[PDB]
Amino acid sequence: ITAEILCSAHLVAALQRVCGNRGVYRPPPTRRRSTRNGTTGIATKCCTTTGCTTDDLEKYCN
Amino acid sequence: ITAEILCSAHLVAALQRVCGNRGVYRPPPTRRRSTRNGTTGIATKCCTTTGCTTDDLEKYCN
Amino acid sequence: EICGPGIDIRNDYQQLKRLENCTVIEGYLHILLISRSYRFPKLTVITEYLLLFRVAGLESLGDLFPNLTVIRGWKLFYNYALVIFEMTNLKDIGLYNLRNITRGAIRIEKNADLCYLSTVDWSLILDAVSNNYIVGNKPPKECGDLCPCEKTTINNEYNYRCWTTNRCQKMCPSTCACTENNECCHPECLGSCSAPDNDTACVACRHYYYAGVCVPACPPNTYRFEGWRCVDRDFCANILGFVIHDGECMQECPSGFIRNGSQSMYCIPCEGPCPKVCEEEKKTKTIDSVTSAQMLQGCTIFKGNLLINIRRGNNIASELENFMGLIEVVTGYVKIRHSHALVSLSFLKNLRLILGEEQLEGNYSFYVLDNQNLQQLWDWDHRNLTIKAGKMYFAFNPKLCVSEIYRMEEVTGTKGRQSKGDINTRNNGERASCESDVLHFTSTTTSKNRIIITWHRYRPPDYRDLISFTVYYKEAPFKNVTEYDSWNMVDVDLPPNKDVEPGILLHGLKPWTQYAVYVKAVTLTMVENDHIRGAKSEILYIRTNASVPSIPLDVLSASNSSSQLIVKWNPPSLPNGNLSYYIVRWQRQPQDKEEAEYRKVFENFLHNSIFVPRPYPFFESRVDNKERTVISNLRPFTLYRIDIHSCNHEAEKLGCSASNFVFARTMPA
Amino acid sequence: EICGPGIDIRNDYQQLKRLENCTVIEGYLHILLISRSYRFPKLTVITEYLLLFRVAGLESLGDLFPNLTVIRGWKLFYNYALVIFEMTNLKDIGLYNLRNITRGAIRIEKNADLCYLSTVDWSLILDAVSNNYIVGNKPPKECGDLCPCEKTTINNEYNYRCWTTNRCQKMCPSTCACTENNECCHPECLGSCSAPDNDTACVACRHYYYAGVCVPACPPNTYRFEGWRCVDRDFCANILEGFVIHDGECMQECPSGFIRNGSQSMYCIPCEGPCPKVCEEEKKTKTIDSVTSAQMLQGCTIFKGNLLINIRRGNNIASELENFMGLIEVVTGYVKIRHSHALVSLSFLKNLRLILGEEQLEGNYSFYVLDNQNLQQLWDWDHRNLTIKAGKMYFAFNPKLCVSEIYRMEEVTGTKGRQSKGDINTRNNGERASCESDVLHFTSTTTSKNRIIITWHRYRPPDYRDLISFTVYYKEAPFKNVTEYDSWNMVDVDLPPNKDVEPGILLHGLKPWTQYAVYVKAVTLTMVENDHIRGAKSEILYIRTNASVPSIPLDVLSASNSSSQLIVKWNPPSLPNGNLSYYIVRWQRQPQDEEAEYRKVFENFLHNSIFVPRPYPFFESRVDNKERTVISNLRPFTLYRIDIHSCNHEAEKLGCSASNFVFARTMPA
């Protein structure tokens, strides 16, 4: 478990490979205004030169 | 007092003007051993200035 | 059938079935990471943006949404109303019914099989075509963009316009918002028309929509909801609540407004800083990074406890000050532990009240510990502070002068509240270089490269102390300069005559540059009294007197027409002053290191060893802002000398710079 | 007539008269700042350098010293034997008899009227012609270098050679040190000759000179004085302490590593250790408050005074004080280390083995330390010796240093029962010391090319309630001199749930054959905040990954000095990964024929907002030692592939390295 630097398709592929069948979450609720809040998530961290660990990949992914 | 940074040819001429009749000369002639050098030369004194005061030139003058 | 307020379909291909009934999507739409045939002719309008990302198997957008006509883009995804990114197997944008995109731009990227990009005239579908981003797709040279109709000018070319290989790009006539075939729609209409120029026969309404009518402004008893329709007062009383303000129904009152009491459906204008309470479920908010402090952005009152533990970080003083600079009242305690990056707590400016609802063990409201670089608190004689209840504990803070924290409890009001061990000089102020008197500057004189600065004579506290001075100066772009870091140091002695005060002349400085200068005294105490005093001066910022600016760089000239000459250039190398304008002149022309460096060091040895102490007219115009200008009214095919000068703010007294000149000939008549 | 030991003529023009009798000038010669006709044909030899600077009225050097032949330059002026600088009115170097300058180079500068610079072949007058400096004089293109003789090649040109407009540059024939006209001198002679090949008829002797004879080495009862003559024992018994006789030379002071013998103070006896400087300072107590202050103690063996070390801030201090005070062995008075907040150990005082106590601090104290905030150990380890003759020892407010260390000190010191009960107290000393901390004893280490598995013993905290965690500090250390305070990569591993397995950590991604410094620290979160906290830590363990396949050889170059032969050279590999044993070379016959930046940030926002987590045959030979080899028996003018491998001591099991190959063709037959 190391902080792999994953970017572009490789970042998504890493998320796709780590999650596999897990994927991500798609429930439609009614949406409150300005619920977009939340920045600098682990997905951004993986692309950075520091990268994100496979555990961090699991944390941001399913 | 404040004096212009003086270096190169002008520095020599300025000293001659200040010394005038006094001039500059070694107090001990023909000393058996060299007194040494590498610091506290009027080259350092006026190229990077702590104040090239007239009195300072006078001390150089003999 | 309205669907919203946001659709996010991903992973499962079959989850796309949630669009079987939706004709309008209220909010955004997300189709990501999708790995058969699904058709949704119901959907026509999307209020917000549309996002597609890594959908395998899909070849064209017309397979899913053939009837999609308007993407209003009421809220944008990074200023984009439609994002098609990393879409594999995708061949074309099959949205042949798309007519109007109201707000945002488009970003189509990384689609190695996508065709028909240049075949779509986006200038008639959206407005901000300049801010679009279509990079990284399949190359049109390797595609085969073929139509089975009309055409217009795309960029500098004129060619046919088609969405797919069966459907063209539909356009309205120049007489009109039109129907299927040549009949203009209603002015309040948008896209297509079930019937011409009728309010109740519009696929999508511009402005707003209510009761089947495209209305410009909402009816009197209705309010703006989202950005396309109007709802009544009872509707937003059921959304979970929302406020009614400025004829709009938003989730929360805008900045500078607060909810009215009892009548909590309207916002009352609060004049001061409205009580922006930030309430977090965790008892003690730990700020261990700049990212963690982000949640405290814009807070005025903090219902909780603050635990600052910042070891590493970025430019922090300006960052926390963005988030926590507005915090004024802390209900609980504040603990600054292991915050080695902090040299000062100044990022907590408006913090003027610390209550103490919860206090650390031993009844402590302010608790700092192990801050190796904390030089000073935010307690300077300008800020106010009040700790209502609790004590203060200071330990293992070596760069913090102990006198600074004694000054704190005066404003804090807890002078005799702490114990004897709460403040310990042993681990606080350990390596301190403070506790000194004040050296006062006397006069400053500035030239383009020289600075003369003098300070008052300093009598040492003891008669026997030998006194000397040290001048610390360095180039500082701005004022946030600390004494511990850079600094150029020169030792000047006290002058022999007591009438002249000590000074120093600096030589070789950049014109128009702000320098940070401060003087420290060298008190060699013969009687080694451990009551060390020393003397230190204030940080003085001095900028060189502006010099004459440099010549303009890279003067290039051309002639696009007779009697006209276009000239462009670069700013000078050494502005030596705030650039104000350029002065250009054109005159008619009649028809036919180591070496000097090495000398330096050798020179110094000489003096260091010889001497010994006794024991056609010119036309002139000023370009105000840009580095480009066009000259008019010239003799065709005649040579011209082009002199260009560069002035600054003080060029009124110093005089403008020299001229970097060029020669150019106009176009032949 | 010998004149010396140095002539300095300046100011007065008539002060030049001091050269009326001198034929040889022992030492240097200065003619400075001089503003009629004076001739000195007597002078012929100059031992040291000759300096001329700003002499007005002199037109040529031939006017003063016509017979100047040899400038020995025994001692140089900035590596120059002859300096002509800022000579006004000077037209040429009239030294037409100058023959040999033995050691230094020449610097002629800033003489706007000086000619005949290129007309002088300095290659036959001096040796280091490359290090000369002739700049700033009258340009040869604007002078007129004219002869009234012989010539040779100067640089790439061939032209006449003359000193002035009347005298040429004299040269000896190719058959020979010659006389005025074609007769070779004596081998021990130099310059000209009053008579051919005679010892007593020489203007200047090479090597040495004695009793009118050019002798190679001094007679048995004579010694070298300066660098040209020999004198007897009684002569240097009269020079002024006096001069020493050593290695057949008569110098001013004994060279480094020698001291004067007692009684017989005319000879130097070899002292084996650091010969005693014996440093005496007028100030009673030398205070070392900076690395600059300690400079005056450089090279001292015995210090007549007191030492007060008060070093708050500083640079790399341990290695610097060790350079200055590392040779001090005996201190006559007392030693006080107060506030010395940078010192973690006193190891910089190695050779210090004796402290007397002539003067003692109030209370009869010879060793007095206080407020040593970060001083963890003395220089008292079981290797060093120490003896305090008189006085007591006081230790106070010394947190990091363990009290057991100072108990061990007085065993060697010899003052076990001399101090009082308050002189050594355990309250403010050893208060928060971590030397007493229980070791996190390592249990096993397993090493691969890039992975390291290391485990330590399970640690039961001193209290039952303490929550225990671990932290692994590891970093690449080239050698062992590694401190815990600096670099360190830190990984927090928790105590395993099962009590049968011991805590460990797996390191991944390490450089093969690289020594890593590893130590583990325990995280004991005490529920009961007992101020008797020491924590736990482990020893610095140095682990080098298992020797992995070495690196490829560096910079393989090949050439062909002959047909059927190929010479190849290379460099050792970058990462040998073990002890180099041999190289394996192979030769095979070859057959005859902002935007991208802006996209970056925008990209990250997309991912940061979309995804969401769930809640011919080869010939082979081995080169044994060197990095060079020659291949024999090859087809002439045939291309060859040269594979080179690098094995080590463990290449028998892990295999030799890869190949850095090159192609070379042999010489044509």
Side-chain angles (χ1 to χ4, degrees), chain C residues 384-657:
Chain C
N384 282 87
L385 177 67
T386 299
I387 293 182
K388 196 165 186 175
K391 294 185 301 300
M392 299 190 302
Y393 180 78
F394 293 75
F396 283 83
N397 304 316
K399 299 187 185 170
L400 247 183
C401 313
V402 68
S403 62
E404 198 78 11
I405 70 186
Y406 292 141
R407 202 189 199 99
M408 181 187 186
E409 53 186 358
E410 303 197 27
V411 184
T412 296
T414 63
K415 298 186 174 184
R417 282 186 177 171
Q418 295 77 17
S419 172
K420 305 176 182 178
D422 302 12
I423 293 93
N424 11 35
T425 72
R426 311 173 182 176
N427 41 25
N428 300 319
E430 162 211 345
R431 262 190 291 268
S433 183
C434 45
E435 238 95 357
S436 303
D437 281 336
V438 178
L439 292 165
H440 301 77
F441 293 115
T442 314
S443 58
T444 61
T445 302
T446 68
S447 79
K448 57 176 183 178
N449 48 17
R450 311 178 196 270
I451 295 188
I452 294 184
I453 169 172
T454 60
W455 51 98
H456 189 267
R457 296 184 66 94
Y458 179 76
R459 303 287 167 169
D462 274 334
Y463 309 95
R464 298 177 172 182
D465 297 351
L466 197 154
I467 175 63
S468 183
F469 293 102
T470 299
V471 178
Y472 299 81
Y473 71 96
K474 82 177 188 178
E475 167 175 356
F478 210 74
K479 295 165 182 171
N480 50 330
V481 183
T482 68
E483 69 144 324
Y484 307 108
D485 279 321
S486 63
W487 298 96
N488 298 281
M489 309 168 187
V490 171
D491 292 328
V492 55
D493 301 328
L494 189 64
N497 284 11
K498 305 175 181 180
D499 288 333
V500 288
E501 53 186 336
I504 176 60
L505 170 57
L506 310 181
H507 41 247
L509 282 72
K510 297 181 180 61
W512 195 251
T513 310
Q514 185 179 64
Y515 283 85
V517 183
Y518 73 90
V519 177
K520 185 187 305 175
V522 188
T523 57
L524 300 181
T525 64
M526 334 306 296
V527 188
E528 184 60 35
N529 280 94
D530 289 328
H531 326 81
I532 311 285
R533 170 71 71 255
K536 194 171 303 177
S537 63
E538 190 190 52
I539 42 175
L540 180 53
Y541 292 116
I542 298 296
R543 170 175 276 97
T544 24
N545 258 9
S547 181
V548 188
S550 174
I551 58 177
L553 299 179
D554 305 329
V555 174
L556 302 185
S557 54
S559 183
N560 66 327
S561 169
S562 59
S563 301
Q564 285 189 353
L565 277 174
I566 61 104
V567 186
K568 202 235 177 180
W569 61 92
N570 293 327
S573 177
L574 307 181
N576 306 335
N578 284 337
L579 296 180
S580 301
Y581 55 89
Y582 293 95
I583 294 182
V584 296
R585 296 196 307 167
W586 56 99
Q587 182 195 35
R588 274 204 56 185
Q589 291 301 303
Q591 295 78 1
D592 307 53
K593 163 187 299 192
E594 55 79 30
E595 173 268 353
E597 197 281 341
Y598 192 27
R599 176 177 325 184
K600 180 55 178 180
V601 50
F602 166 74
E603 167 85 16
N604 287 325
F605 190 87
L606 199 49
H607 312 324
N608 205 2
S609 165
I610 293 183
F611 317 90
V612 52
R614 314 203 217 104
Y616 275 101
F618 265 93
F619 294 158
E620 192 163 341
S621 290
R622 305 170 188 260
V623 187
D624 41 327
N625 52 326
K626 294 183 178 180
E627 284 77 13
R628 65 198 190 103
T629 178
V630 187
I631 309 179
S632 58
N633 301 21
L634 309 169
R635 300 290 187 268
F637 200 76
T638 306
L639 196 61
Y640 278 84
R641 172 190 180 90
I642 305 299
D643 285 26
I644 301 187
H645 302 260
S646 173
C647 327
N648 55 15
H649 64 289
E650 255 288 330
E652 301 131 347
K653 295 181 178 180
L654 322 159
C656 196
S657 67

Side-chain angles (χ1 to χ4, degrees), chain A residues 7 22 24-25 36 39-41 43-44 47 59-62, chain D residues 508 600 603-615:
Chain A
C7 271
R22 289 159 40 189
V24 258
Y25 263 41
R36 178 256 159 187
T39 50
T40 68
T44 296
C47 218
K59 291 165 186 173
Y60 191 80
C61 205
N62 278 8
Chain D
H508 40 251
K600 177 57 177 185
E603 164 87 14
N604 289 326
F605 190 86
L606 198 50
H607 309 327
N608 206 15
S609 167
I610 292 181
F611 317 86
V612 53
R614 326 208 180 117

Side-chain angles (χ1 to χ4, degrees), chain A residues 24 26 31-33 39, chain C residues 10-11 15 18 240 251:
Chain A
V24 258
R26 12 87 172 274
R31 287 291 74 196
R32 278 308 144 241
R33 181 239 195 192
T39 50
Chain C
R10 63 182 55 184
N11 333 316
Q15 176 145 152
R18 291 153 40 183
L240 181 57
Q251 162 165 306

Side-chain angles (χ1 to χ4, degrees), chain C residues 84 90-93 108 111-117 137-138:
Chain C
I84 301 180
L90 194 64
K91 306 181 177 183
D92 59 287
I93 304 94
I108 302 177
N111 313 280
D113 200 45
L114 199 65
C115 281
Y116 290 93
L117 311 98
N137 301 279
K138 187 175 193 184

Side-chain angles (χ1 to χ4, degrees), chain D residues 261-544:
Chain D
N261 185 24
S263 71
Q264 306 163 331
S265 302
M266 290 296 301
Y267 308 92
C268 308
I269 193 172
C271 118
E272 183 173 356
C275 308
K277 191 63 180 179
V278 185
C279 294
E280 182 186 34
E281 186 168 322
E282 307 198 5
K283 311 203 176 188
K284 51 176 182 59
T285 301
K286 176 56 171 297
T287 160
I288 309 96
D289 60 333
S290 60
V291 288
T292 106
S293 57
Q295 184 186 19
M296 315 183 95
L297 295 185
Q298 190 173 6
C300 306
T301 300
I302 310 177
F303 180 70
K304 297 178 177 177
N306 307 323
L307 284 188
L308 168 62
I309 302 175
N310 184 96
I311 309 181
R312 313 275 271 188
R313 306 291 181 170
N315 322 89
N316 52 334
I317 292 172
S319 58
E320 197 75 295
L321 301 191
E322 170 173 336
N323 173 36
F324 298 109
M325 318 174 63
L327 302 90
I328 276 77
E329 304 184 7
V330 178
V331 172
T332 59
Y334 63 89
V335 179
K336 185 176 177 181
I337 299 98
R338 172 194 59 183
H339 297 326
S340 309
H341 290 320
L343 300 188
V344 297
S345 176
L346 266 56
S347 62
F348 55 99
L349 307 174
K350 286 121 153 239
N351 299 342
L352 178 62
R353 288 182 266 267
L354 284 181
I355 301 181
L356 300 184
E358 280 184 348
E359 181 179 10
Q360 303 182 1
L361 286 177
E362 207 191 52
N364 291 84
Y365 294 97
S366 190
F367 199 83
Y368 195 97
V369 304
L370 180 64
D371 194 4
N372 326 330
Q373 276 274 351
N374 299 345
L375 177 77
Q376 315 185 257
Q377 188 218 12
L378 308 164
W379 85 107
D380 167 60
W381 185 247
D382 303 340
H383 293 57
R384 302 285 178 265
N385 281 87
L386 173 67
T387 299
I388 293 181
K389 195 164 186 177
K392 293 185 301 299
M393 299 188 304
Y394 178 81
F395 296 76
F397 302 92
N398 306 327
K400 258 314 173 189
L401 230 168
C402 270
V403 67
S404 61
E405 205 70 17
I406 73 181
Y407 289 145
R408 198 192 200 99
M409 180 189 189
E410 62 186 347
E411 301 197 30
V412 186
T413 292
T415 64
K416 295 188 175 183
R418 286 183 175 174
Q419 294 82 18
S420 180
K421 308 175 179 179
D423 301 10
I424 292 86
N425 65 327
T426 64
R427 295 172 172 174
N428 47 31
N429 287 6
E431 185 174 4
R432 294 160 294 263
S434 72
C435 104
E436 304 286 338
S437 74
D438 310 340
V439 185
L440 304 182
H441 300 82
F442 293 115
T443 314
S444 58
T445 57
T446 303
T447 63
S448 69
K449 49 178 180 178
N450 45 22
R451 313 176 197 268
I452 294 182
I453 295 182
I454 175 173
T455 62
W456 52 98
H457 189 266
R458 299 186 63 95
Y459 181 75
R460 303 289 167 166
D463 276 334
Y464 309 95
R465 300 178 168 183
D466 298 351
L467 197 153
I468 176 62
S469 182
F470 294 103
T471 299
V472 182
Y473 300 81
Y474 71 98
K475 81 173 188 180
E476 169 172 351
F479 211 75
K480 296 165 179 171
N481 49 331
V482 182
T483 66
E484 69 146 320
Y485 307 111
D486 282 322
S487 58
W488 298 99
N489 297 278
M490 307 165 188
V491 172
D492 291 328
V493 55
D494 298 329
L495 189 65
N498 285 13
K499 304 178 179 180
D500 290 331
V501 290
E502 53 186 339
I505 186 58
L506 167 60
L507 309 181
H508 40 251
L510 282 71
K511 298 181 179 60
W513 183 267
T514 304
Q515 190 177 59
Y516 286 84
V518 185
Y519 74 90
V520 179
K521 186 189 308 177
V523 185
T524 59
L525 300 180
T526 62
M527 335 309 296
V528 190
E529 182 62 35
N530 279 94
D531 289 327
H532 327 79
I533 273 307
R534 308 184 186 274
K537 207 181 303 180
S538 62
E539 194 190 47
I540 43 174
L541 180 55
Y542 294 116
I543 299 297
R544 170 178 280 97

Side-chain angles (χ1 to χ4, degrees), chain A residues 8-9 12-13 16 22-35 39-40 62, chain C residues 4-12 15 18 33 53-54 86 110 239-240 242 251-252 294:
Chain A
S8 298
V12 196
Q16 286 164 344
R22 289 159 40 189
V24 258
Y25 263 41
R26 12 87 172 274
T30 178
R31 287 291 74 196
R32 278 308 144 241
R33 181 239 195 192
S34 300
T35 44
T39 50
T40 68
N62 278 8
Chain C
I7 308 302
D8 188 294
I9 306 174
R10 63 182 55 184
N11 333 316
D12 285 324
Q15 176 145 152
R18 291 153 40 183
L33 314 172
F53 174 72
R54 302 208 72 178
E86 284 201 314
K110 297 190 187 178
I239 317 175
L240 181 57
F242 280 19
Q251 162 165 306
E252 190 59 29
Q294 182 185 19

